[PDB]
Curated annotation (Swiss-Prot), chain B:
This is Cytoplasmic dynein 1 heavy chain 1. Homodimer. The cytoplasmic dynein 1 complex consists of two catalytic heavy chains (HCs) and a number of non-catalytic subunits presented by intermediate chains (ICs), light intermediate chains (LICs) and light chains (LCs); the composition seems to vary in respect to the IC, LIC and LC composition. The heavy chain homodimer serves as a scaffold for the probable homodimeric assembly of the respective non-catalytic subunits. The ICs and LICs bind directly to the HC dimer and dynein LCs assemble on the IC dimer. Interacts with DYNC1LI1; DYNC1LI1 and DYNC1LI2 bind mutually exclusive to DYNC1H1. It comes from Homo sapiens (Human). Cytoplasmic dynein 1 acts as a motor for the intracellular retrograde motility of vesicles and organelles along microtubules. Dynein has ATPase activity; the force-producing power stroke is thought to occur on release of ADP. Plays a role in mitotic spindle assembly and metaphase plate congression. Belongs to the dynein heavy chain family. It is found in: Cytoplasm, Cytoskeleton. It is linked to Charcot-Marie-Tooth disease, axonal, type 2O: An axonal form of Charcot-Marie-Tooth disease, a disorder of the peripheral nervous system, characterized by progressive weakness and atrophy, initially of the peroneal muscles and later of the distal muscles of the arms. Charcot-Marie-Tooth disease is classified in two main groups on the basis of electrophysiologic properties and histopathology: primary peripheral demyelinating neuropathies (designated CMT1 when they are dominantly inherited) and primary peripheral axonal neuropathies (CMT2). Cortical dysplasia, complex, with other brain malformations 13: An autosomal dominant disorder characterized by global developmental delay with impaired intellectual development. Some patients show signs of peripheral neuropathy, such as abnormal gait and hyporeflexia. CDCBM13 is associated with variable neuronal migration defects resulting in cortical malformations. Dynein heavy chains probably consist of an N-terminal stem (which binds cargo and interacts with other dynein components), and the head or motor domain. The motor contains six tandemly-linked AAA domains in the head, which form a ring. A stalk-like structure (formed by two of the coiled coil domains) protrudes between AAA 4 and AAA 5 and terminates in a microtubule-binding site. A seventh domain may also contribute to this ring; it is not clear whether the N-terminus or the C-terminus forms this extra domain. The chain holds residues 3631 to 3679 of 4646 of the full protein. It comes from the Eukaryota.
Length: 48, 49
């Protein structure tokens, strides 16, 4: 991808595939609704 | 990077977290809170006074 991908996974398989694929890079799952989105985003920007 | 600091009689208290190794480990990164900002503390750092 060039633009950051938007996944459409009604079955929920793609999300767990992504978790598995980037698990070695310490991938974090969040949500827009969560109030924790701001600090998670900021930490991702600072430290990969 | 190794650092050497002279004139320690004018010691800056900002070094207190560094000297006390008040590091916080998260996501494989060792964050040190220098003043009000966080810095990934490289394991090769060393300071002499």
């Amino acid at each position: 991808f060039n633009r950051y991908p938007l996944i459409i996974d009604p079955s929920g398989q793609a999300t767990e595939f992504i978790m598995n694929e980037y698990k070695d890079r310490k991938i974090t799952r969040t949500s827009f609704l969560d109030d924790a989105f701001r600090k998670n985003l900021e930490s991702a920007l600072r430290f990969g | 990077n190794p650092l050497l600091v002279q004139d320690v009689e004018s010691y800056d208290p900002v070094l207190n977290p560094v000297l006390n190794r008040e590091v916080r480990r998260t996501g494989g990164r060792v964050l040190i809170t220098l003043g009000d900002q966080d810095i990934d503390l490289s394991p090769s750092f060393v300071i002499f006074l």
